[PDB]
Structure formats: C-alpha cells, structure tokens
C-alpha cells in the first residue's frame, strides 16, 4: 500500500529481529487497517523502506505473531484474521477471516502450543480458537461488560487471564467445568504474565496504578492516566515496560520502582517490544505515527 495510517496500534519484534506493525486510521473518510514488516527496524515507519505490506478491510485493534511466519489479527469488523508471510517474506496473504464476534474484536493472545488462540471482544464473549481447522472450539460469556484484555499463560496451554470493564480479572483453565476464577478497585485495563513465574502476573488499571499479583498484593502509581499495556523484557530477570494514555513510557524493576521514563511520544503510547538481539533496546509505537527506539540504562 502507498501509505500507513497515522494510528500505530501494534509493535512486535520476532526472534531474529524483524518488526511487525499494525496500524489503523481512526479518523478521516476511510477507517481501515494495515499490516507491515520491517526487517530493518530503524527504517520504521517509512512505507517505502518496508519488507512486506498489506491492507485489511477494517481497523487493527490488536495483533500477535504466530511463530515467525503468521500474524493473528483482532479487527473492528468482529472477525479474527490470520495472515502468513510468503516463502520470500515480501507478501502478506490471508488464510482465514472468521466473523464470530457480534462486535469489535479488541484483544488477541496466542496459547503456548502455538496452534490455539484466545480472542476477547466488546461483544462480552471470549473464544478459544483452533488456528489449523480455522474454527472456534469454545465460546464463553463469563464477563458482564466489554473484554479489555486476554493474556494466554506463558507455559500452560489451557491457562489464560482475562479482564473486563465489569471490574473482574478471571484466571482460566479449560480443564475445570467452571473454568473462570475471579482474582482480586479501579477497572482492569492491562494484563502481563511474569515470564519466569507461571504463578505471578501484573495488571494495570484505569487510574494509572500497576499491581503485582501472586495466584495463591504489591502496588505502585506509575502513570496519571489509564495503563494501556504492560510488557516484560526478554532478560533472565525481566524489566517491566508500562505503556499509557498519559503519553509516557516507564520501565520498572522487581519492586515496581521507576528506572526509565520516556516522554518522546506526543500522543497515546500503544505497544512496546524489547529487542531479541539487544536486551537494553525497547521499541514503542504510538498514535503520533512515531516508532521511537529506547536505550534502557542497565
């Protein structure tokens, strides 16, 4: 496509170091989305300096990598899409576009195996998908309001977190006949599993507070506005990068104390991604069309 719309929604670095980009036009005559690949991460967001590019019918609310080839997309159309890079990694081709949600698909998360996924929607439902058969295995109306975030477990394929505007955080486990479990203030907005402890996770609220939760609690006032995301570093003892609507980025330690603070962004900070190659490198995209690269003081 000749252009990528100013609202950059998702930034995801793969294993080798390429950058995945999801963006939508949330204003203007056309409300559509686009998927882009940047083998040169420092080129981004230059539409001409890209490796691969594609345009979706509707906006991109969220996305994730399906290994190193495919991309799972949560669209405003109510459909879940899968787009796999070709043999040369220059074209992006659609495999499935399944409209199962009666409203905007807001969050997406791939389950440990890599063959299954969990979609969270504004239609209140949660769906567990089989990527190979291209069908939904199960549909769960456990929440009362819109689903804000779904976070599949790092190591358990039947475990995944959920949080909604109904003030609930649910711990899932498909093995139980009543799979959800309420864990616990202000509305939950972001969910991040700890990559070393499959029993600890962090959640960020609408009042800017980020909190530490052990399944069997610690809190800090990071931002002045809603916490849009929480992403852990690839480090053996990770750092936590907290995105926000107050246009700032912060990197916190194990006790939730602030180390980094970046005001580089002039609009909402949507996604963050740490470099597989340089663990002191964090990339943050935003609604101001910036692809800012950060050097975390380690």
């Amino acid at each position: 496509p000749a252009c990528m719309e100013r609202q950059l929604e998702a930034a995801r670095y793969r294993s080798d170091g390429a950058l995945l980009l999801g963006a939508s036009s949330l204003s203007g005559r056309c409300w559509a989305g686009s998927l882009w690949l940047f083998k040169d991460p420092c080129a981004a967001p230059n539409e001409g300096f890209c490796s691969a590019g594609v345009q979706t019918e509707a906006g991109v609310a969220d996305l994730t990598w399906v290994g190193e080839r495919g991309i799972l997309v949560a669209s405003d159309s109510g459909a879940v899409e899968l787009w796999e890079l070709d043999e040369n990694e220059t074209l992006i081709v659609s495999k499935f576009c399944k409209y199962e949600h009666d409203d905007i698909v807001s969050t997406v998360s791939v389950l440990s195996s890599g063959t299954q996924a969990v979609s969270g929607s504004k239609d209140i439902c949660i769906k567990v998908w089989d990527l190979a058969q291209q069908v939904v295995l199960s549909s769960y109306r456990a929440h009362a309001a819109q689903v804000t975030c779904v976070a599949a477990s790092p190591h358990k394929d039947s475990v995944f977190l959920s949080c909604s505007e109904d003030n609930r955080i649910l711990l899932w486990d498909t093995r139980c006949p009543k799979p959800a479990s309420q864990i616990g203030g202000y509305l939950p907005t972001s969910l991040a599993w700890h990559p070393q402890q499959s029993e600890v996770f962090v959640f960020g609220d609408e009042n800017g507070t980020v909190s530490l939760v052990d399944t069997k609690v610690l809190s800090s006032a990071v931002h002045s506005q809603c916490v849009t995301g929480l992403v852990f570093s690839p480090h053996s003892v990770p750092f936590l990068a907290s995105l926000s609507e107050d246009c700032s980025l912060a990197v916190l330690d194990s006790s939730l104390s602030e180390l980094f603070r970046s005001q580089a962004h002039r609009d909402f900070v949507r996604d963050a991604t740490w470099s597989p190659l340089n663990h002191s490198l964090l990339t943050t995209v935003g609604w101001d069309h910036q692809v800012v690269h950060h050097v975390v003081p380690t």
Binding site: L26, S27, A58, D166, D246
Partner: protein, 621 residues
C-alpha cells in the same frame, strides 16, 4: 411493511457500507459518528493537542441521507459515570462533542446506552445538551430486557449465578430506565431502544415495558435459531413479543455479525404478514392511537353536521337500538291490540334522525302502531329533521325544536328513546336531560336506555402521561391539563387492574329525592410493580332487558366505533409495588349551571384532589 435498520460498529467506507445495507433491504444505519476506538483527550497535554481531523466529513453524505438514514451512536469508551474523576470530566466533554456533532448533521436519532444502575451524570450531560441549541433529534436509550450480569454463563468457580428467584430483581433494567427518564423530566425526546436477549425473561419483566416509549427493538443475530433449511427463525415465545412490538409500530434493528453463513429482515417481513387481519374497530381507530381529544358536550354545544354523520355510521349501535324498541313494542302491545294501540314514542335528542328511522324500522318488524316525536335543541340538526319529515316521514313524526327539559309535550309518552351517553356514560349529562323529561313519561313508560354504568381501571402509560403534559396552555392553570378527562384510543399502555363499576344511573327514577351527585371508592388489587398515571374510564348500558351496549374491553360490543375510552389523569405519577392496592375516590358534583367530576388517589399514597369545584373542567348544563 416493517421499518428496519442495521446496527454496525465498523463502517470503513460510509458510502459503501450504506449502499450494501440498503441493497440488503434496510431503511437506516446505526453507525458511530466518530471511530469507536478513537479515545480523545480534553484536559492534559499533549494528547489534548491531537492534530488532524477529529472524524470523517459531513460532505460524504447528502443532507437528506444524514437526516433520514443515519442513527448515530455514542462512543463505547464514553463513561460519564466513572468512579475516576479524570475519566468523568473527559467523558463529559467527549459526550457533548458527539451529541453536538449529531445535531450538526441533523441526525433523526442518536443511541446512548443504559448498561448500569447509575447513569446520573449521563442524564445530567444529556439534559444539559437538550437545553443547548436548536435541536429536534431523538435520543434512543439502548437498554436490555435482561442485564448482561444476569445472563452470563455460570462458569465462575467463586462467583456462581444466584439460582434464587427475585421477582423485583429480575426487573432491574426497567428501574435503570425509569430513574433515567425521571432525572431528565420525562423529556418527549428520550425514547427506549429495547435490547432483546437470547433467552426471554419472565413475562412480568416483559410486561414492565408496557406503556413505555419504545421507539426501537434491537434483535441481535445470536437470538435466531437456525431452522431445517439453514435460515434464521425465532421461538414462539420470541415471535409473540415481536407481534406485541408490531402493534407499537417500533423500528426493528438487526445488530451483530452474520451467523447463518438479508434473511433476518425477510423473516421479520414474513412475521409481519402472518399477523391477524385488523377488525373494523382496529382499522377505524388507526391514526387515533393515544391521541387526546376533548370529550364532546352536545348539551352545551351544537354538534357539527360531519360529527352527526360519524355517529350515524355505526350500524351495530343502531341495530341494537332497533331490536330494543322491537322487543318493547311486543312486550307492550299484544297481537289482539295490533291496530287498536298506538304507542307514543318520543326520540329525545333526535340529531339528524337515525334513532327516528330505527324507531320506524322497529315498528315494521314488530307490526305495531307508533306515533313519533323527534325532540332536538340543536336548530341546525332540526333543519335536517324537518327536511326528512317533509320528504319521507310525514304526519307520523312530529318534529319538536326544543330542549327536552323545557318542552311542554301535548300528551305523555309510552317510550322515551335517547342516545345521550358519553364514554364515561353520564359525562354528556343524560341523568339531567332524562330527569327533566321524566314528568311527561307515562306512570308505566319505558326509557331506552333504562340503565347505564360507568367503569374505571387504573393504568400506566408514560406515553400518555407525557401527552397530557404537552397540553399546557397559556392564560390558565399550568396544571389544568391534568384535571380534565380526555377521550382517547388508549394504545401504548398497561392496565394495572380490571375495570370496576363506578357510577350507576337508572331511568325512570322513582327514588324519593333521587339526587344525581355521587361519591364512589374503588380498591384495585395490583399484581405487578408499576407507575400509575391515570384511570381509563369505560361504560356499559342496558337499552332494554338483554339488549345492551358496551365499551368495557372485556364485554365490548363488536364493531362499535361510536366511543373510545375516557382518560382521567393525575398530576404526579404514583409508584405501586406488587401486592399493593390502588384506592381511588371519584365524585360527581354539580350546581344549577355545571356538572363536574373530582377524583383523588388515597392508596398506596394520597394524591391531591383533582379538579376541586370544576376549576379546570366543567360540563355545561
């Protein structure tokens, strides 16, 4: 045959989407006026200084398309009632922005959601927009039959779905709406967009929406059961609800994605065609639904010709009048007296001669001799009468141009016939009119009608309560519109208790010191939770023996167009809980010049006495 619209949250190309929606078979589109995910900031930097256009352009559609096909939608992130202060302040400015953007485009309606008990600030912000600028837009509140919390799957280990039966608790969404419109002062611009769910709630919960201003019905695709041929259909319980909404002429809305991979719209059209054909009363009253008219006073006023014409176009009432005279002739003149006895029949209040003709038809079939008198005070009707007497009737009919209470008749009558009844039976003043004509009745004469009784039933109708408010006029009491009866074909309403008899009049009146003034107390057992707005008045009359006329819904004379129910309103609505009794009092009062009614509710709470001394409403004697 059905006004329908498509609900979407994804309109990438506004012109393409509309084209596809219209080609599908719709009439309008519910789409967001701003991108649903585009959260905006109005307080802190630098997100407040967000450059570029804030949404797509008004030029993309013509003024007619914007005014007839686009129902706007409030952005889902706008939470004016948030517990977070910054989110409230942000959502206040954000809400006004989208409402003023929809007013700017002249959109016919704008959707706002009610999905929680506390929508106080939402109401405040809406009330403040309604009082800001030159409006006209309708505001449809999207409110579910069943709360999303009460329809969740029982899949939370430590939060199970409470399996207990809570009658009032199952009606929580109605209180969400009730409280919201009370805060907004029953604005005629705020209507209900009722969201129908997958499994219908208990019928009491559904009945709670009777008499509410439902302008739209939201049917989500997920409620459609797929049939044998793979096409979407609805349960017989859901179908019955659709048939109740079709009487209220709501606009059907189809929301959500296609799950029968339009057909949903075609199923609605099939349902619309499979409804029973409208009867004579139903096809006549169409157009008059919940339209408040003034009760006629034929005594005080001379009825127009076109008015007499419509009262004459009621075959049922004239065939019932004929057979009542037919039976009275036989029961008074035995076959041996066939030509020896001439009965003195006086049609008191003759109009343009329909009762006189019925009296004639009743003498041909009863084969007895009759001498007619057609008394009438309206001199204009008397012209029609005197031209009938010349061209057809002759010496048999003696036209009398006078008030029946003044007339000094030549001889006494065997049968006095009259049609002096209003929707509340005695509201056109028949008790006074026939009392004044009682002296010239034989000491064994028959009055037709011989008896009439009024009925009352308490009702809930915020639609009618709002309609009575709209009747405020200058140079009078600002509240007078609530202290007067209205003739109205009640339609968008709920009757909270069965009709009970109110006032009864008999003719002739042999009671020592009869007196037409009345005082009646009625106790109405209410089996539902509700809001009382008025009392429907109805009537029943005994013309002769088993020949009767009725407007009581449960005994209604079929095909009888001549009357609609009366509505006796109250200044302030009254909350009634299930099990409570509504106790009303009604008075029939009078002086030598006027006759009026007064009424007060005395349970579950007292009301003010309405129309004390006929200050708002009198009937002229």
């Amino acid at each position: 045959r059905v006004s329908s619209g498509r609900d979407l949250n994804c309109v990438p190309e506004i012109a393409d989407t509309l084209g596809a929606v219209a080609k599908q078979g719709f009439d309008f589109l519910c789409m967001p006026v701003f991108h649903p995910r585009f959260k905006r900031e109005f307080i802190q930097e630098p997100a407040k200084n967000r450059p570029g256009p804030q949404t797509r352009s008004d030029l993309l559609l013509s003024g007619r398309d914007w005014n007839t096909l686009i129902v706007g939608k409030l952005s889902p992130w706008i939470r004016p009632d948030s517990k977070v202060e910054k989110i409230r302040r942000n959502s206040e400015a954000a809400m006004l922005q989208e409402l003023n953007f929809g007013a700017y485009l002249g959109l016919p309606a704008f959707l706002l959601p009610l999905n929680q008990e506390d929508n106080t600030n939402l109401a405040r912000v809406l009330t403040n927009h309604i009082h800001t600028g030159h409006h006209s837009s309708m505001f449809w509140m999207r409110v579910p039959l069943v709360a999303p919390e009460d329809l969740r799957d029982d899949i939370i280990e430590n939060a199970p779905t409470t399996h207990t039966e809570e009658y009032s608790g199952e009606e929580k969404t109605w209180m969400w709406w009730h409280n919201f419109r009370t805060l907004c002062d029953y604005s005629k611009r705020i209507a209900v967009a009722l969201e129908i769910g997958a499994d219908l709630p208990s019928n009491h919960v559904i009945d709670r929406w009777l008499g509410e201003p439902i302008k739209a019905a939201i049917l989500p695709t997920s409620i459609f059961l797929t049939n044998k041929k793979g096409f979407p259909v609805l349960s017989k319980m859901h179908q019955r609800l659709i048939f109740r909404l079709l009487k209220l002429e709501v606009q059907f809305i189809i929301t959500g994605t296609n799950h029968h991979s339009c057909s949903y719209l075609q199923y609605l059209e099939y349902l619309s065609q499979n409804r029973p054909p409208p009867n004579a009363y139903e096809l006549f009253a169409k157009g008059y639904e919940d339209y408040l008219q003034s009760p006629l006073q034929p005594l005080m006023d001379n009825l127009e010709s076109q008015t007499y014409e419509v009262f004459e176009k009621d075959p049922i009432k004239y065939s019932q009048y004929q057979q009542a005279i037919y039976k009275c002739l036989l029961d008074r003149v035995p076959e041996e007296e066939k030509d020896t006895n001439v009965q003195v029949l006086m049609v008191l209040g003759a109009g343009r001669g329909p009762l006189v003709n019925a009296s004639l038809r009743a003498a041909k079939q009863a084969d007895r001799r009759i001498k007619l008198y057609a008394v009438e005070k309206n001199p204009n009707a008397v012209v029609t009468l005197e031209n009938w007497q010349f061209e057809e009737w002759g010496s048999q009919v003696t036209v009398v141009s006078s008030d029946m209470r003044e007339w000094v008749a030549p001889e006494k009558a065997d049968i006095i016939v009259s049609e002096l009844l209003g929707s509340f039976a005695d509201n056109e003043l028949s008790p006074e009119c026939l009392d004044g004509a009682q002296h010239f009745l034989k000491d064994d004469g028959v009055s037709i009608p011989g008896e009439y009784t009024s009925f009352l039933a308490p009702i809930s109708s915020s639609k009618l309560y709002n309609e009575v408010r709209a009747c405020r006029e200058k140079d009078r009491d600002p509240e007078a519109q609530f202290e007067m009866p209205y003739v109205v074909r009640l339609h968008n309403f709920h009757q909270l208790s069965a009709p009970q008899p109110c006032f009864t009049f008999s003719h002739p009146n042999r009671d020592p010191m009869i007196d037409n003034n009345r005082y009646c107390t009625l106790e109405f057992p209410v089996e539902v939770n509700t809001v009382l707005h008025g009392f429907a008045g109805y009537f029943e009359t005994v013309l002769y023996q088993d020949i009767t006329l009725s407007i009581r819904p449960e005994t209604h004379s079929p095909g009888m167009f001549s009357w609609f129910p009366i509505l006796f309103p109250i200044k302030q609505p009254i909350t009634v809980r299930e099990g409570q009794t509504i106790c009303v009092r009604f008075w029939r009062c009078s002086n030598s010049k006027k006759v009026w009614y007064e009424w007060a509710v005395t349970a579950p709470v007292c009301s003010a006495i309405h129309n004390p001394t006929g200050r708002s409403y009198t009937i002229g004697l």
